[PDB]
Protein backbone atom coordinates (compact mmCIF):
# COMPACT_ATOMS: atom_id res chain seq x y z
CA UNK A 1 0.00 0.00 0.00
CA UNK A 2 0.85 3.86 -0.64
CA UNK A 3 2.43 4.93 2.60
CA UNK A 4 0.49 8.51 1.96
CA UNK A 5 -2.82 7.06 1.81
CA UNK A 6 -4.37 7.52 5.12
CA UNK A 7 -7.76 5.93 6.17
CA UNK A 8 -8.51 8.63 8.39
CA UNK A 9 -8.02 12.87 9.34
CA UNK A 10 -6.55 11.74 12.43
CA UNK A 11 -4.13 8.94 10.65
CA UNK A 12 -3.06 11.87 8.04
CA UNK A 13 -2.14 14.08 10.82
CA UNK A 14 0.12 12.13 12.44
CA UNK A 15 2.07 11.23 8.89
CA UNK A 16 5.35 12.84 8.28
CA UNK A 17 5.79 16.15 7.25
CA UNK A 18 5.82 17.53 3.68
CA UNK A 19 9.18 17.73 1.71
CA UNK A 20 8.31 19.35 -1.19
CA UNK A 21 5.55 21.79 -2.22
CA UNK A 22 4.75 21.58 -5.80
CA UNK A 23 3.06 25.48 -6.99
CA UNK A 24 1.29 26.15 -10.28
CA UNK A 25 2.96 28.97 -11.86
CA UNK A 26 1.73 30.79 -14.40
CA UNK A 27 2.61 33.94 -17.22
CA UNK A 28 -0.71 33.79 -18.84
CA UNK A 29 -1.76 37.74 -18.27
CA UNK A 30 1.94 39.27 -17.36
CA UNK A 31 2.79 39.59 -20.75
CA UNK A 32 5.15 37.41 -21.19
CA UNK A 33 5.72 34.93 -24.21
CA UNK A 34 6.54 31.68 -21.81
CA UNK A 35 4.70 28.97 -21.22
CA UNK A 36 2.82 28.36 -17.45
CA UNK A 37 5.13 25.63 -15.26
CA UNK A 38 4.35 23.49 -12.36
CA UNK A 39 7.13 24.92 -9.54
CA UNK A 40 8.99 22.07 -7.34
CA UNK A 41 9.63 24.08 -3.91
CA UNK A 42 11.95 22.83 -1.01
CA UNK A 43 9.64 23.49 2.09
CA UNK A 44 12.01 21.30 5.02
CA UNK A 45 14.12 23.70 7.08
CA UNK A 46 16.88 21.03 7.21
CA UNK A 47 17.46 20.91 3.13
CA UNK A 48 20.45 22.64 2.37
CA UNK A 49 17.99 23.83 -0.78
CA UNK A 50 14.95 24.99 1.41
CA UNK A 51 12.77 27.65 0.80
CA UNK A 52 14.34 27.75 -3.35
CA UNK A 53 13.17 26.34 -6.54
CA UNK A 54 14.38 23.29 -7.06
CA UNK A 55 13.07 22.93 -10.44
CA UNK A 56 10.16 23.81 -12.71
CA UNK A 57 8.34 21.24 -15.49
CA UNK A 58 8.35 23.77 -18.16
CA UNK A 59 5.04 23.48 -19.99
CA UNK A 60 5.66 22.69 -23.78
CA UNK A 61 2.09 25.36 -24.70
CA UNK A 62 1.78 28.66 -23.56
CA UNK A 63 -1.35 30.80 -21.63
CA UNK A 64 -2.65 27.61 -20.53
CA UNK A 65 -3.30 29.58 -17.44
CA UNK A 66 -2.59 26.92 -14.45
CA UNK A 67 -4.72 27.33 -11.35
CA UNK A 68 -5.91 24.33 -9.86
CA UNK A 69 -4.37 20.85 -9.79
CA UNK A 70 -4.29 17.33 -7.71
CA UNK A 71 -3.50 13.94 -7.33
CA UNK A 72 -4.40 10.89 -9.87
CA UNK A 73 -4.57 8.73 -6.36
CA UNK A 74 -5.10 9.77 -2.61
CA UNK A 75 -6.45 8.24 0.78
CA UNK A 76 -10.10 8.18 -1.03
CA UNK A 77 -8.54 4.57 -2.74
CA UNK A 78 -8.64 3.34 1.07
CA UNK A 79 -12.60 3.41 -0.01
CA UNK A 80 -14.50 0.11 0.39
CA UNK A 81 -14.61 0.80 -3.82
CA UNK A 82 -11.24 2.41 -3.94
CA UNK A 83 -9.61 0.40 -7.17
CA UNK A 84 -6.71 -1.45 -6.81
CA UNK A 85 -3.03 -0.77 -7.66
CA UNK A 86 -3.15 2.93 -7.90
CA UNK A 87 -1.13 4.65 -5.87
CA UNK A 88 0.09 9.02 -5.19
CA UNK A 89 2.26 9.05 -8.02
CA UNK A 90 0.49 11.98 -10.88
CA UNK A 91 0.04 15.20 -11.00
CA UNK A 92 -3.16 16.02 -13.04
CA UNK A 93 -2.60 19.92 -14.08
CA UNK A 94 -5.09 21.28 -16.52
CA UNK A 95 -5.57 24.60 -18.00
CA UNK A 96 -8.10 26.91 -16.78
CA UNK A 97 -7.62 28.82 -20.36
CA UNK A 98 -6.63 25.58 -22.51
CA UNK A 99 -8.97 23.31 -21.36
CA UNK A 100 -5.57 20.99 -21.84
CA UNK A 101 -4.53 18.52 -19.44
CA UNK A 102 -0.83 17.54 -18.21
CA UNK A 103 -0.08 13.94 -16.30
CA UNK A 104 3.13 14.46 -14.69
CA UNK A 105 4.72 11.91 -13.03
CA UNK A 106 6.62 12.16 -9.14
CA UNK A 107 8.69 9.33 -9.38
CA UNK A 108 10.87 8.01 -8.93
CA UNK A 109 12.60 11.36 -8.27
CA UNK A 110 9.97 13.60 -6.66
CA UNK A 111 12.38 16.80 -6.49
CA UNK A 112 12.53 16.48 -11.01
CA UNK A 113 8.97 15.56 -11.92
CA UNK A 114 8.39 14.72 -15.95
CA UNK A 115 5.45 15.40 -18.29
CA UNK A 116 4.80 11.75 -19.43
CA UNK A 117 1.41 12.21 -20.77
CA UNK A 118 -0.28 15.25 -22.44
CA UNK A 119 -4.56 15.32 -23.34
CA UNK A 120 -4.83 17.85 -25.54
CA UNK A 121 -8.04 20.40 -25.27
CA UNK A 122 -9.57 19.37 -28.46
CA UNK A 123 -9.88 15.70 -27.04
CA UNK A 124 -10.94 16.96 -23.39
CA UNK A 125 -13.94 19.19 -25.60
CA UNK A 126 -14.80 16.20 -27.66
CA UNK A 127 -15.41 13.63 -25.01
CA UNK A 128 -17.03 15.39 -22.38
CA UNK A 129 -18.00 18.67 -24.07
CA UNK A 130 -16.52 20.49 -21.40
CA UNK A 131 -14.00 23.36 -21.53
CA UNK A 132 -12.09 25.56 -18.79
CA UNK A 133 -11.16 22.75 -16.80
CA UNK A 134 -10.76 24.05 -13.00
CA UNK A 135 -10.43 21.55 -9.77
CA UNK A 136 -8.98 18.59 -9.61
CA UNK A 137 -9.91 15.38 -7.53
CA UNK A 138 -9.14 12.03 -6.98
CA UNK A 139 -12.23 9.44 -6.41
CA UNK A 140 -12.06 5.89 -5.52
CA UNK A 141 -13.09 5.18 -8.95
CA UNK A 142 -11.68 7.85 -10.95
CA UNK A 143 -10.12 11.68 -11.41
CA UNK A 144 -12.40 14.13 -11.41
CA UNK A 145 -12.65 17.61 -12.72
CA UNK A 146 -14.97 20.87 -13.07
CA UNK A 147 -14.97 23.50 -16.06
CA UNK A 148 -16.60 26.14 -16.41
CA UNK A 149 -18.93 26.01 -19.12
CA UNK A 150 -19.17 24.03 -22.62
CA UNK A 151 -17.14 23.48 -25.70
CA UNK A 152 -18.24 27.25 -26.58
CA UNK A 153 -17.98 29.42 -23.38
CA UNK A 154 -21.05 29.29 -22.15
CA UNK A 155 -22.90 26.52 -20.41
CA UNK A 156 -23.81 23.97 -18.46
CA UNK A 157 -20.56 23.52 -17.25
CA UNK A 158 -19.69 20.69 -15.19
CA UNK A 159 -17.76 17.74 -13.66
CA UNK A 160 -15.75 15.38 -16.06
CA UNK A 161 -13.79 12.08 -15.11
CA UNK A 162 -10.52 10.82 -16.41
CA UNK A 163 -9.94 6.87 -16.09
CA UNK A 164 -7.50 5.78 -13.44
CA UNK A 165 -5.28 4.10 -15.35
CA UNK A 166 -5.36 5.55 -18.97
CA UNK A 167 -5.97 8.81 -17.59
CA UNK A 168 -8.10 9.13 -20.63
CA UNK A 169 -11.27 11.30 -20.70
CA UNK A 170 -14.50 9.20 -20.05
CA UNK A 171 -16.96 12.41 -20.20
CA UNK A 172 -19.79 14.10 -18.34
CA UNK A 173 -19.92 12.91 -14.69
CA UNK A 174 -23.63 14.29 -14.34
CA UNK A 175 -26.49 11.76 -15.63
CA UNK A 176 -29.51 14.41 -14.24
CA UNK A 177 -28.20 17.91 -13.72
CA UNK A 178 -31.69 19.29 -12.78
CA UNK A 179 -31.43 23.21 -13.39
CA UNK A 180 -27.59 23.38 -12.64
CA UNK A 181 -25.80 25.73 -15.25
CA UNK A 182 -22.93 27.31 -13.42
CA UNK A 183 -19.73 25.36 -11.99
CA UNK A 184 -16.42 26.11 -10.24
CA UNK A 185 -15.52 23.72 -7.74
CA UNK A 186 -16.59 20.36 -5.70
CA UNK A 187 -15.88 17.68 -3.16
CA UNK A 188 -17.75 15.11 -1.53
CA UNK A 189 -18.19 13.25 1.61
CA UNK A 190 -17.99 9.59 0.13
CA UNK A 191 -19.38 7.52 2.80
CA UNK A 192 -22.62 9.06 2.48
CA UNK A 193 -22.46 9.36 -1.07
CA UNK A 194 -22.53 12.97 -1.76
CA UNK A 195 -20.98 15.70 -4.08
CA UNK A 196 -21.57 19.43 -3.57
CA UNK A 197 -20.64 22.01 -6.67
CA UNK A 198 -20.59 25.73 -6.54
CA UNK A 199 -20.91 28.19 -8.97
CA UNK A 200 -18.75 31.24 -10.00
CA UNK A 201 -19.56 32.30 -14.02
CA UNK A 202 -19.30 30.73 -17.64
CA UNK A 203 -15.86 31.21 -19.84
CA UNK A 204 -17.34 33.97 -21.80
CA UNK A 205 -18.44 35.89 -18.90
CA UNK A 206 -14.75 35.80 -16.59
CA UNK A 207 -12.19 35.41 -19.09
CA UNK A 208 -12.34 38.96 -19.98
CA UNK A 209 -12.11 39.99 -16.75
CA UNK A 210 -14.55 40.95 -14.17
CA UNK A 211 -17.46 43.33 -15.69
CA UNK A 212 -19.51 44.83 -12.86
CA UNK A 213 -22.73 44.93 -14.66
CA UNK A 214 -22.41 41.10 -14.91
CA UNK A 215 -22.92 40.39 -11.43
CA UNK A 216 -26.63 40.24 -10.86
CA UNK A 217 -27.01 38.32 -13.92
CA UNK A 218 -24.34 36.16 -14.43
CA UNK A 219 -22.84 35.22 -12.00
CA UNK A 220 -24.07 32.36 -9.32
CA UNK A 221 -24.33 31.84 -5.88
CA UNK A 222 -25.85 27.99 -5.00
CA UNK A 223 -24.64 25.41 -3.65
CA UNK A 224 -26.03 21.61 -5.57
CA UNK A 225 -26.55 18.59 -3.88
CA UNK A 226 -25.97 15.55 -5.48
CA UNK A 227 -26.66 11.26 -5.51
CA UNK A 228 -22.70 10.77 -5.74
CA UNK A 229 -23.93 7.38 -6.77
CA UNK A 230 -27.19 8.29 -8.79
CA UNK A 231 -24.99 11.37 -10.87
CA UNK A 232 -27.90 13.11 -10.00
CA UNK A 233 -28.77 16.99 -8.79
CA UNK A 234 -31.10 16.59 -5.93
CA UNK A 235 -31.63 19.76 -3.86
CA UNK A 236 -29.87 23.03 -4.31
CA UNK A 237 -29.73 26.10 -1.89
CA UNK A 238 -29.28 30.03 -2.58
CA UNK A 239 -26.30 31.70 0.15
CA UNK A 240 -28.13 34.88 -0.04
CA UNK A 241 -30.12 36.53 -2.89
CA UNK A 242 -27.51 39.43 -2.69
CA UNK A 243 -24.22 37.53 -2.75
CA UNK A 244 -22.67 36.80 -5.72
CA UNK A 245 -19.49 34.26 -6.62
CA UNK A 246 -19.94 31.08 -4.65
CA UNK A 247 -16.02 29.78 -5.09
CA UNK A 248 -14.32 26.89 -2.66
CA UNK A 249 -15.96 23.96 -1.10
CA UNK A 250 -14.66 22.69 1.92
CA UNK A 251 -16.51 19.30 3.73
CA UNK A 252 -15.02 18.71 7.34
CA UNK A 253 -12.54 16.17 6.60
CA UNK A 254 -14.68 13.71 9.34
CA UNK A 255 -16.69 11.62 7.12
CA UNK A 256 -18.88 11.36 10.06
CA UNK A 257 -19.84 14.60 10.02
CA UNK A 258 -22.54 15.91 6.95
CA UNK A 259 -21.24 19.66 6.75
CA UNK A 260 -18.71 22.11 5.13
CA UNK A 261 -17.82 25.46 4.39
CA UNK A 262 -18.04 27.94 1.00
CA UNK A 263 -17.19 31.30 0.41
CA UNK A 264 -19.45 33.62 -1.62
CA UNK A 265 -17.14 36.42 -2.36
CA UNK A 266 -18.89 39.56 -2.99
CA UNK A 267 -22.40 41.17 -1.75
CA UNK A 268 -24.65 43.36 -4.19
CA UNK A 269 -25.62 45.05 -1.36
CA UNK A 270 -22.67 46.37 0.33
CA UNK A 271 -19.37 44.11 -0.63
CA UNK A 272 -18.89 42.42 1.86
CA UNK A 273 -18.11 38.94 1.85
CA UNK A 274 -19.63 35.93 3.84
CA UNK A 275 -18.79 31.83 4.59
CA UNK A 276 -21.46 29.90 4.60
CA UNK A 277 -22.32 26.30 6.66
CA UNK A 278 -24.14 23.78 4.84
CA UNK A 279 -24.87 21.12 6.79
CA UNK A 280 -27.75 18.32 6.72
CA UNK A 281 -30.10 17.61 9.51
CA UNK A 282 -33.82 16.98 10.09
CA UNK A 283 -33.59 15.02 6.79
CA UNK A 284 -32.85 18.34 4.82
CA UNK A 285 -29.34 20.20 3.92
CA UNK A 286 -29.46 23.40 5.16
CA UNK A 287 -26.95 26.46 5.31
CA UNK A 288 -26.20 28.68 6.95
CA UNK A 289 -23.95 32.10 6.90
CA UNK A 290 -21.51 31.99 9.97
CA UNK A 291 -19.30 34.53 8.79
CA UNK A 292 -19.04 38.19 7.33
CA UNK A 293 -16.41 40.60 6.78
CA UNK A 294 -17.49 43.82 5.88
CA UNK A 295 -15.54 45.95 2.99
CA UNK A 296 -12.97 49.00 3.93
CA UNK A 297 -13.41 52.46 3.23
CA UNK A 298 -10.59 54.05 1.46
CA UNK A 299 -10.34 56.86 -0.69
CA UNK A 300 -7.18 57.03 -2.35
CA UNK A 301 -4.74 54.70 -4.27
CA UNK A 302 -7.55 52.48 -5.33
CA UNK A 303 -7.68 50.35 -8.55
CA UNK A 304 -10.50 52.10 -11.58
CA UNK A 305 -12.78 49.18 -10.80
CA UNK A 306 -13.14 50.22 -7.13
CA UNK A 307 -12.78 53.76 -7.36
CA UNK A 308 -16.71 54.70 -7.13
CA UNK A 309 -17.25 52.47 -4.37
CA UNK A 310 -14.38 54.35 -2.30
CA UNK A 311 -14.04 50.84 -0.27
CA UNK A 312 -11.90 47.69 -0.36
CA UNK A 313 -13.99 44.78 -0.46
CA UNK A 314 -12.13 42.22 1.29
CA UNK A 315 -12.96 39.71 -1.48
CA UNK A 316 -12.30 36.32 0.31
CA UNK A 317 -11.25 33.73 -2.56
CA UNK A 318 -10.02 31.07 -0.93
CA UNK A 319 -11.14 28.74 2.17
CA UNK A 320 -9.22 26.14 3.77
CA UNK A 321 -9.72 23.52 7.23
CA UNK A 322 -7.24 21.84 9.35
CA UNK A 323 -7.29 18.06 9.15
CA UNK A 324 -8.79 18.19 13.33
CA UNK A 325 -11.71 20.09 11.41
CA UNK A 326 -10.60 22.73 14.31
CA UNK A 327 -9.89 25.78 11.69
CA UNK A 328 -11.17 27.48 8.88
CA UNK A 329 -8.73 29.56 7.04
CA UNK A 330 -9.50 32.70 4.93
CA UNK A 331 -7.17 34.56 2.26
CA UNK A 332 -8.62 38.04 1.89
CA UNK A 333 -7.26 39.19 -1.83
CA UNK A 334 -8.51 42.78 -1.49
CA UNK A 335 -8.15 43.96 1.75
CA UNK A 336 -4.74 41.44 1.93
CA UNK A 337 -5.23 39.31 5.17
CA UNK A 338 -5.19 35.85 6.08
CA UNK A 339 -7.15 34.87 8.78
CA UNK A 340 -7.74 31.84 11.12
CA UNK A 341 -11.29 30.95 12.40
CA UNK A 342 -11.40 28.33 15.46
CA UNK A 343 -14.81 26.37 14.05
CA UNK A 344 -14.54 24.16 17.02
CA UNK A 345 -18.38 25.30 17.19
CA UNK A 346 -18.46 25.40 13.37
CA UNK A 347 -22.06 27.49 13.84
CA UNK A 348 -20.30 29.95 15.61
CA UNK A 349 -16.38 30.39 14.13
CA UNK A 350 -13.83 32.39 16.50
CA UNK A 351 -11.16 34.57 14.99
CA UNK A 352 -8.23 33.48 16.78
CA UNK A 353 -5.63 34.70 13.91
CA UNK A 354 -4.62 37.44 11.34
CA UNK A 355 -1.50 38.63 9.53
CA UNK A 356 -1.23 41.26 6.99
CA UNK A 357 0.17 40.76 3.59
CA UNK A 358 0.12 42.70 0.56
CA UNK A 359 -3.61 44.05 -0.02
CA UNK A 360 -4.81 47.18 -1.85
CA UNK A 361 -5.74 47.90 1.81
CA UNK A 362 -2.60 47.38 4.32
CA UNK A 363 -0.56 47.39 1.10
CA UNK A 364 1.74 45.50 3.90
CA UNK A 365 5.22 44.47 3.26
CA UNK A 366 6.50 41.29 4.35
CA UNK A 367 8.36 41.16 7.78
CA UNK A 368 11.86 39.64 6.35
CA UNK A 369 11.10 43.27 3.65
CA UNK A 370 10.13 41.69 0.88
CA UNK A 371 7.67 43.92 -1.67
CA UNK A 372 4.55 41.90 -1.69
CA UNK A 373 2.23 42.69 -5.00
CA UNK A 374 -1.26 41.79 -4.83
CA UNK A 375 -2.48 40.15 -1.64
CA UNK A 376 -3.24 36.55 -0.13
CA UNK A 377 -5.13 34.13 -2.32
CA UNK A 378 -4.98 30.44 -2.48
CA UNK A 379 -3.58 28.80 0.53
CA UNK A 380 -2.42 24.95 1.52
CA UNK A 381 -2.27 23.93 5.37
CA UNK A 382 0.03 20.85 6.15
CA UNK A 383 -1.67 17.18 7.39
CA UNK A 384 -0.09 18.16 10.81
CA UNK A 385 -1.84 21.89 10.59
CA UNK A 386 1.42 24.02 11.66
CA UNK A 387 2.33 25.33 8.13
CA UNK A 388 0.12 27.42 5.96
CA UNK A 389 1.39 28.13 2.32
CA UNK A 390 0.24 31.04 0.81
CA UNK A 391 0.32 32.53 -2.68
CA UNK A 392 -1.18 35.78 -4.50
CA UNK A 393 -2.78 35.39 -7.69
CA UNK A 394 -6.58 34.59 -8.63
CA UNK A 395 -6.95 34.87 -12.38
CA UNK A 396 -4.83 36.31 -15.40
CA UNK A 397 -6.99 39.14 -15.93
CA UNK A 398 -8.40 39.74 -12.69
CA UNK A 399 -5.23 40.50 -11.54
CA UNK A 400 -4.83 42.91 -14.13
CA UNK A 401 -7.72 45.03 -12.60
CA UNK A 402 -7.68 44.69 -9.10
CA UNK A 403 -3.43 45.15 -9.17
CA UNK A 404 -2.97 46.92 -12.45
CA UNK A 405 0.67 47.70 -11.21
CA UNK A 406 1.55 44.07 -11.64
CA UNK A 407 0.73 41.48 -9.86
CA UNK A 408 4.29 39.27 -9.47
CA UNK A 409 4.10 36.06 -7.83
CA UNK A 410 5.40 35.13 -4.36
CA UNK A 411 4.81 31.82 -1.57
CA UNK A 412 4.81 32.97 2.05
CA UNK A 413 4.71 30.20 4.92
CA UNK A 414 2.79 30.95 8.00
CA UNK A 415 3.31 29.20 11.49
CA UNK A 416 -0.12 28.05 12.80
CA UNK A 417 -0.52 27.16 16.33
CA UNK A 418 -2.13 24.52 17.42
CA UNK A 419 -4.67 26.20 20.22
CA UNK A 420 -5.12 29.47 18.72
CA UNK A 421 -2.48 32.08 16.68
CA UNK A 422 -0.79 32.90 13.44
CA UNK A 423 2.08 34.15 12.43
CA UNK A 424 4.37 34.99 9.41
CA UNK A 425 7.49 32.95 8.93
CA UNK A 426 10.51 35.37 8.75
CA UNK A 427 12.54 33.24 6.86
CA UNK A 428 10.70 31.40 4.32
CA UNK A 429 9.82 32.87 1.24
CA UNK A 430 9.58 32.24 -2.65
CA UNK A 431 10.10 34.76 -4.94
CA UNK A 432 8.62 33.51 -8.74
CA UNK A 433 10.05 36.44 -10.51
CA UNK A 434 7.45 37.33 -13.09
CA UNK A 435 5.63 34.19 -12.70
CA UNK A 436 2.61 34.37 -11.08
CA UNK A 437 1.75 31.94 -8.77
CA UNK A 438 -1.57 30.02 -7.62
CA UNK A 439 -1.98 26.79 -6.10
CA UNK A 440 -0.16 24.45 -3.54
CA UNK A 441 0.19 21.02 -3.28
CA UNK A 442 2.42 19.64 -0.17
CA UNK A 443 4.17 16.28 -1.25
CA UNK A 444 2.40 13.57 0.60
CA UNK A 445 -0.69 15.40 0.70
CA UNK A 446 -2.36 18.31 3.08
CA UNK A 447 -5.56 19.70 3.57
CA UNK A 448 -7.39 19.95 0.11
CA UNK A 449 -5.93 17.38 -1.70
CA UNK A 450 -7.19 14.10 0.21
CA UNK A 451 -10.71 13.31 1.43
CA UNK A 452 -11.48 10.26 3.52
CA UNK A 453 -13.57 7.12 4.02
CA UNK A 454 -12.61 6.65 7.96
CA UNK A 455 -13.49 8.54 11.23
Known amino acids: RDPTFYPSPKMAMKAPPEDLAYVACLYTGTGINRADFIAVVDVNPKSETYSKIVHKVELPYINDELHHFGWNACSSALCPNGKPNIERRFLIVPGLRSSRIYIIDTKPNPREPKIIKVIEPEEVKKVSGYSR ?269 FYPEGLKGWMVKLNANPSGGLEIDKEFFVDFGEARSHQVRLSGGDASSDSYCYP
Not at 186 to 206: G, M
Not at 223 to 238: P, Q
Not at 329 to 357: A, C, H, M
Open 133 to 401: LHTVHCGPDAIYISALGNEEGEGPGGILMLDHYSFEPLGKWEIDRGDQYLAYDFWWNLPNEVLVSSEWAVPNTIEDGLKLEHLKDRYGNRIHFWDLRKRKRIHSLTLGEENRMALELRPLHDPTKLMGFINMVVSLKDLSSSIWLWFYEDGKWNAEKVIEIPAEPLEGNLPEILKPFKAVPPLVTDIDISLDDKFLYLSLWGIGEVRQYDISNPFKPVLTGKVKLGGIFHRADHPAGHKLTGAPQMLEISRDGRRVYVTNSLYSTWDNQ
